[PDB]
Paper text:
MtbTOP1 and topoisomerase I present in all bacterial pathogens are type IA topoisomerases that are needed for resolving topological barriers that require the passage of DNA through the break created on single-stranded DNA (ssDNA). M. tuberculosis topoisomerase I (MtbTOP1) is a validated target for much needed new antibiotics that can be used against the MDR-TB (multidrug-resistant tuberculosis) cases that are difficult to treat (1–3). D1–D4 form a toroidal assembly found in all topoisomerase IA while D5 represents the Topo_C_Rpt subgroup of bacterial topoisomerase C-terminal repeats.
No significant conformational change has been observed among these structures even though they have different crystal symmetries. This indicates that the N-terminal toroidal assembly of the enzyme is quite stable by itself.
Residue numbers in the entry: 18 to 702
């Protein structure tokens, strides 16, 4: 008989049902080996090596020490029994570098003498599994070296950086490179909010009627806003910087309440005149099929799922044969999937809404072996979301919602474009002796197209307009008169930059090239668990400890938390996965120093060991645990310190001949860092 090893029991039962008899299917429950987690994990043979606890022999080309987990040994025993009376072996783990490394570890652990076959697949269906089992491929050692390079890199990073965090910030603080970079993103946005200063600006909102000079203009009444006063443009929210002063761009005029009421008063009684009216046709192409990044984003905005929950649901959907592999950076659809989406599309929305030619959204992927297709429904024919809503009855009651999202996205990717018109409106009038201009913008939707099947949701904090929202304006002619219904002077203020959500954080991690489909949700979940970041509604808010660690790394180990260097490291790991870079050369280069890599990187600056040593002794600590905020109304610098009791406020005041003497207050997590202003600081003292 034949043996087949997978990672989870569900995958094992499904593959067992599809392969039939003559195949035995067992799971390995994930990884069977790992680096030593304690001194007791080191076998007696390696206890003579002083590097065994670290598990990496940096002086022997980073030779790792792989030990079988104490709870996993029994599993291996079972796998060592089944291999006795079978005549063939099949490693059916996931096709990414994780699953390839699991396969490699299984080979090193079991050491089979019968032929070995690695079968890969990105959907669990009977045709795809039977096809994969009949056409195997060789074990990609480059993927194994990429995953292994990541593991060793993380072990060395923790080994070199964790003690710094224990001595300078707080013990029991777990280190983490990419986590500290994403934490730096969030801390940077919070700092931007703290330094922000609002600025006031005023305009005039007008309600205009056109049913007198055009007794059939729909809509009859529309809105317009003041844009110019006697040739000078009226300031808006975009004309100020983060400190509240006008930008060094075009010349504008800032209005207040008295000026706006004066202009509206001098405008009442008269009429306005249409100066310009321009309609431009536009077409909107459908959204690409889902990948991990876009799936987590849209699942967060529309379904309020966290990235972790999205990936859990998507894992259960994938292993049960409902969706394709959820860890992909590809938006490609095979011909059968395209034909399925076009069939369901024509069946549900009609022939005019189908794209007249099959649409392909092929983009550059990081590795052609790890990602084949997009996240889409599985099979030659897509299971209807109602049938899936029938089968998934019980504890998992959102899986049908995620599945329906994927289905609507996939079907909508093969539908027709969305036609419409965009409208520009320039109006003029006379307030006293000053000419005034009233602008109005419009946008219609003549044909919805794919928008009848899928519409992306706007980010909650960023705000904006959806792709199917209409701002309809009547058809007007240059020189047409308009009647004024109301003149309301309007006041506004510049708003601070928006906080990140999980969706906008995932988008940032992808744009900066810092995250991969395998790491988004783990980055978010990890930075939330370790206490660096918490949630206010849907906003990510950094704690003060996150300020302390981010400040330390920024001030003394800047290369570790630089965005471009981190993205470069991810690109080099990917280059190892493709066989263009070698694990040994990269690890020597990064740890001990070399001549390869982007300028001024850790590898080009002496390596990780020497840089952590040099930068560690190059500090005097002192204010590492102090986050400077501002000064008070007497000139005393106020800052926040993180101690055993948590975050507390501190300043320095004189103290009767024995001056100075510090003053401390206590603050909980109720006050976000941007709310802790000078007034709030004085109230808490």
């Amino acid at each position: 008989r034949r043996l087949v090893i997978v990672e989870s029991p569900t995958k094992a039962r499904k593959l067992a049902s599809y392969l039939g008899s003559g195949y035995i299917v067992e799971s390995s429950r994930g990884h069977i080996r790992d680096l030593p987690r304690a001194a007791s994990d080191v076998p007696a043979k390696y206890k003579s090596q002083p590097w065994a606890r670290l598990g990496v022999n940096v002086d022997a080309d980073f030779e790792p020490l792989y030990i079988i987990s104490p709870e996993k040994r029994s599993t291996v025993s079972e796998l060592r029994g089944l291999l006795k009376d079978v005549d063939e072996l099949y490693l059916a783990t996931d096709g990414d570098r994780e699953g390839e490394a699991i396969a490699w570890h299984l080979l090193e652990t079991l050491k089979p003498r019968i032929p070995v076959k690695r079968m890969v697949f990105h959907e669990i269906t009977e045709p795809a599994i039977r096809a994969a089992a009949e056409h195997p491929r060789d074990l990609d050692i480059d993927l194994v070296d990429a995953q292994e390079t990541r593991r060793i890199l993380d072990r060395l990073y923790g080994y070199e950086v964790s003690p710094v965090l224990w001595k300078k910030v707080a013990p029991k603080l777990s280190a983490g490179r990419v986590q500290s970079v994403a934490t730096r993103i969030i801390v940077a946005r919070e700092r931007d909010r703290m330094a922000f200063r609002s600025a006031a600006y005023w305009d005039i909102l007008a309600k205009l009627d056109a049913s007198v000079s055009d007794p059939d203009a729909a809509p009859p009444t529309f809105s317009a806003r003041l844009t110019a006063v006697a040739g000078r443009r009226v300031a808006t929210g975009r004309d100020f910087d983060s400190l509240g002063t006008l930008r060094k761009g075009d010349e504008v005029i800032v209005l207040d309440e008295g000026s706006a009421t004066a202009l509206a008063a001098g405008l009442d009684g008269t009429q306005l005149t249409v100066a310009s009216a321009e309609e431009k046709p536009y077409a909107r192409r459908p959204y690409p099929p889902f990948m991990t990044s876009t799936l987590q984003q849209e699942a967060s905005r529309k379904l309020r799922f966290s990235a972790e929950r999205t990936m859990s649901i998507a894992q259960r959907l994938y292993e049960n044969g409902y969706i394709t592999y959820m860890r992909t950076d590809s938006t490609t659809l095979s011909e059968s999937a395209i034909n399925a989406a076009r069939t369901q599309a024509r069946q549900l929305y009609g022939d005019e809404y189908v794209a007249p030619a099959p649409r392909q959204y092929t983009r550059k992927v990081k590795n052609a072996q790890e990602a084949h297709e997009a996240i889409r429904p599985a099979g030659e024919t897509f299971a209807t979301p109602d049938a899936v809503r029938r089968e998934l009855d019980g504890p998992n009651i959102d899986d049908f919602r995620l599945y329906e999202l994927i289905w609507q996205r996939t079907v909508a990717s093969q539908m027709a474009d969305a036609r419409g018109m965009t409208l520009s409106l320039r109006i003029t009038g006379m307030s006293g002796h000053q000419e005034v201009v009233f602008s109005a913008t419009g946008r219609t939707l003549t044909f919805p197209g794919f928008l009848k099947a899928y519409v992306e949701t706007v980010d909650e904090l960023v705000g904006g307009e959806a792709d199917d929202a209409e701002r309809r304006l009547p058809h007007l002619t240059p020189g047409q008169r308009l009647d004024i219904v109301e003149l309301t002077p309007d006041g506004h203020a510049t708003n601070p930059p928006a906080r990140y959500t999980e969706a906008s954080l995932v988008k940032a991690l992808e744009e900066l090239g810092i995250g991969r489909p395998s790491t988004y949700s783990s980055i978010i979940k990890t930075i939330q668990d370790r206490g660096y970041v918490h949630k206010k509604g849907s906003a990510l808010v950094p704690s003060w400890v996150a300020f302390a660690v981010t400040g330390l790394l920024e001030q003394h180990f800047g290369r570790l938390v630089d965005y471009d260097f981190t993205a470069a490291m991810e690109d080099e790991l990917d280059e190892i996965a493709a066989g263009n870079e070698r694990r040994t050369n990269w690890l020597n280069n990064f740890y001990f120093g070399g001549d390869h890599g982007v300028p001024d990187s850790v590898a080009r600056s002496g390596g990780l060991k020497k840089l952590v040593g040099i930068n560690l002794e190059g500090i005097d600590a002192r204010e590492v645990n102090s986050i400077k905020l501002f000064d008070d109304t007497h000139g005393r610098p106020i800052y926040v310190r993180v101690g055993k009791n948590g975050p507390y406020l501190e300043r320095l005041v004189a103290g009767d001949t024995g001056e100075p003497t510090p003053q401390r207050a206590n603050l909980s997590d109720s006050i976000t860092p941007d709310e802790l202003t000078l007034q709030v600081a004085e109230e808490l003292f």
